Structure formats: structure tokens, C-alpha cells
């Protein structure tokens, strides 16, 4: 989950 969101950066 973190990675899925983190992609924004
Ligand atoms: C002990 C080996 O555990 C693993 O390989 C592994 C791989 C991915 C993940 C993982 C978890 C959350 C998210 C979000 O987004 C993406 N990925 N967890 C564990
Ligand atoms: N918001 N951007 C990111 O989080 C992000 C962009 C690109 C990459 C990345 C990682 C690894 C490679 C490689 N060829 O090993 C290339 N680009 N990470 C994060």
C-alpha cells in the first residue's frame, strides 16, 4: 500500500 501511494513522488 505505501508503495502504491508513494509513486506520486
Ligand atoms: C517477506 C517478503 O515480503 C515481500 O516480498 C513483500 C512484498 C511486497 C509487499 C507490499 C506490501 C504493501 C504494498 C503496498 O503498496 C506493496 N507491497 N510486502 C511484502
Ligand atoms: N515519484 N516518483 C517515484 O517515486 C519514483 C520514480 C522512479 C523510480 C525509479 C526507481 C528505480 C529505477 C531503476 N531503473 O532502478 C528507476 N526509477 N523510483 C521512484
Amino acid at each position: 500500500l505505501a508503495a502504491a501511494l508513494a509513486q506520486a513522488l
Side-chain angles (χ1 to χ4, degrees):
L1 171 61
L5 299 177
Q7 64 175 306
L9 309 178

